[PDB]
């Protein structure tokens, strides 16, 4: 009977909420009310990079902290050196509408995807010295939003057909499918130890997944509209989310609920990208009013503004040693800040 | 040095090739095609030629008077469209195709047009509006079994504008009906009263051989308006 099942679901949800309320004895503000502020944080552009002909959708830093990749809505994928502002590679694409990029931890491969529902894996170290397409992965029933490597042989993807997948590159086939969302899936982030990951999915819900088994572990709620970005805290025990209600929030995985919210009364636009700093004290967010903001993760205050762009800001990244911060917008320029 | 010269050489070669690509990119006009299941955008695509499973997008290319056109159709996607529709904020024009022989699938078309008009990322984009299935409308109106007044009451108080330009050899009833249907869309278009983009309406059929020329002329007007606005002469 449908009604009996729905009533049982409602009862279980009430039990969940009562157990969750019973586990909150204090707030983050009260504990963190006896520390020192970080003060005004000022940054300047050190390098500016040119060459694209249309808007940019994604960037990704390398593991040596010197090279980076970038993808634009005109069918090109460029690999740059940021110490000298040179160009090391330029690759043309087959479909221009591209929405994601990734850079393998060993420096050998790159990947991309978009509105053609296909993931393309490119080789960068051929014997002849020329870039050629090494593999194409097909089987999704909607466009691809993000993709991130694990090693040179395994890769995880998320699409707007409500599902996520894990792929074996050499054979060419799927190996585990993650299903259970309701709307589209917009972002994902991998754990530092590469045994779990988190997904945000455009129905005001977030989920944590276990790679080696294929089931869900926890779900978190609290936002009021679509979730657009996600990332892990450096120790793998927290994560931050941003949405289109103009709010960021922080979630913890052991207490299983929400701790702190970042908002203001003058902010009436959405959020496009989030990222942490090396120690976990600075949280950097990108907005649709042409500039980026810098928050303090324990006091819930604002500490800085980065404001040099002309159009919507779309991508943001911090290196693996803390040195530089790179941002990219819809006017076809990247910028590097320190 | 002796290992930095090669880097500058590679950068110079890459920049040369990028210039040759920019020339070709900045001389092609990009259009987006939108419609519904009962419309005939498949037939319009098939007639615009000489003038992998689970594939997500389709492309078609044609040439009018030595100007190149690219036109994009959306294939295997879900029903919701509030995320990918933003990838089209810089096309020259949208082409909205509507069937006009239903009387009960027209309100949905009106709502979809009204939703495209008022979005934040598509307020500088112009629309070319096609109304297929004119023979069916003519037959259905002359037959007289179905009445438009059951869905739109205001048709009970409508008269053809005296300055109308009816086609020769046409019953006045068909003129009344089709002018009413056109007025609905034009009223939605001019309701905002902003003046930064325009609607261009037309009447077409299943086997007609003039659509590409219509698109040509309308795109010409769009680009002229853009140029004049660049010079502050508006």
């Amino acid at each position, epitope marked *: 009977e449908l009604d009996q099942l729905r009533q049982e679901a409602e009862q279980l949800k009430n039990q969940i909420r009562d157990a969750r309320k019973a586990c909150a004895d204090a707030t983050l503000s009260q504990i963190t009310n006896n520390i020192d502020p970080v003060g005004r944080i000022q940054m300047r552009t050190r390098r500016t990079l040119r060459g694209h002909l249309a808007k940019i959708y994604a960037m990704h830093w390398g593991t040596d902290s010197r090279l980076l990749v970038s993808a634009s809505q005109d069918g090109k994928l460029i690999i740059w050196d940021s110490y000298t502002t040179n160009k090391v590679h330029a690759i043309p694409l087959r479909s221009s509408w591209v929405m994601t990029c990734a850079y393998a931890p060993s420096g050998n491969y790159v990947a991309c995807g978009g509105l053609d529902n296909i993931c393309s894996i490119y080789n960068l170290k051929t014997r002849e010295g020329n870039v050629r397409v090494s593999r194409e992965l097909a089987g999704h029933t909607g466009y691809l939003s993000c993709c991130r490597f694990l090693d040179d042989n395994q890769i995880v993807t998320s699409s707007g057909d409500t599902t996520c997948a894990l792929w074996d590159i050499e054979t060419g086939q799927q190996t585990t499918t993650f299903t259970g969302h309701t709307g589209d899936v917009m972002s994902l982030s991998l754990a530092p130890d590469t045994r779990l990951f988190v997904s945000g999915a455009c129905d005001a819900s977030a989920k944590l997944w276990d790679v080696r088994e294929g089931m869900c572990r926890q779900t978190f709620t609290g936002h009021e509209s679509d979730i657009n970005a996600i990332c892990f805290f450096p120790n793998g025990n927290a994560f931050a989310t941003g949405s289109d209600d103009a709010t960021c929030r922080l979630f913890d995985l052991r207490a299983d609920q929400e701790l702190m919210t970042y908002s203001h009364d003058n902010i009436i636009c959405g959020i496009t990208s989030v990222s942490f700093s090396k120690s976990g004290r600075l949280l950097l967010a990108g907005y649709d009013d042409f500039n980026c903001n810098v928050w303090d993760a324990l006091k819930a205050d604002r500490a800085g503004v980065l404001a040099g762009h002309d159009n919507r800001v779309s991508c943001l990244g911090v290196t693996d040693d803390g040195m530089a911060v790179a941002t990219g917008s819809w006017d076809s320029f990247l910028k590097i800040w320190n | 040095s002796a290992e930095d010269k090669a880097a500058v050489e590679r950068s110079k070669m890459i920049e040369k090739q990028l210039q040759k690509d920019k020339q070709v990119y900045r001389r092609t006009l990009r259009l987006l095609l939108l419609g519904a299941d009962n419309s005939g955008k498949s037939t319009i695509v098939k007639q615009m030629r000489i003038y992998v499973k689970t594939s997500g997008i389709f492309e078609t290319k044609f040439q009018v008077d030595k100007v190149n056109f690219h036109m994009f159709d959306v294939g295997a996607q879900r029903d919701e469209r509030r995320k990918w529709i933003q990838c089209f904020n810089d096309v020259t024009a949208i082409i909205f195709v509507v069937d006009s022989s239903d009387y009960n699938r027209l309100q949905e078309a009106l709502n979809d047009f009204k939703s495209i008009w*008022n979005n934040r990322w598509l307020r500088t984009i112009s629309v070319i509006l096609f109304l297929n299935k004119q023979d069916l409308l003519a037959e259905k109106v002359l037959a007289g079994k179905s009445k438009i007044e059951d869905y739109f009451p205001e048709f009970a108080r409508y008269t053809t504008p005296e300055d109308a330009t009816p086609e020769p050899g046409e019953d006045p009833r068909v003129t009344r009906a089709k002018y009413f249907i056109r007025k609905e869309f034009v009223d939605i278009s001019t309701a905002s009263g902003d003046g930064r983009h325009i609607c261009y309406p037309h009447f077409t059929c299943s086997v007609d051989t003039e659509n590409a020329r219509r698109i040509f002329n309308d795109c010409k007007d769009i680009i002229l308006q853009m140029n004049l606005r660049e010079y502050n002469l508006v």
Partner: nanobody
Amino acid sequence: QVQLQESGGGLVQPGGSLRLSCAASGFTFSNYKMNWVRQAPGKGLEWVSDISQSGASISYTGSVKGRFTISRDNAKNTLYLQMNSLKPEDTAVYYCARCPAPFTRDCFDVTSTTYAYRGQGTQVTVSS
């Protein structure tokens, strides 16, 4: 969590009148635009009426003009619809709908593909 819940419905003779109410929980009420939709046996999802944040802009469909009225209370977080002079062609299931974003004037909220911010619905039957 986002919750929309409906109340009022049932069986009415032709020529009757009735009133449908909807209660909302989990978001700021006044930053949003709201709509009514309905499902008839053997058809798709239609559109009936819509109202804006303050209440000064209202819009209807062709076949309900002169019979239905839309109302919005912000202090008590409620959406109302008043139904007069029913017909047999109104028997259906009725849902309320919220737009996906705040501070905006467009919608994309009739889809069947399990649109998230929609209620469960109430049944109205008009027969003798």
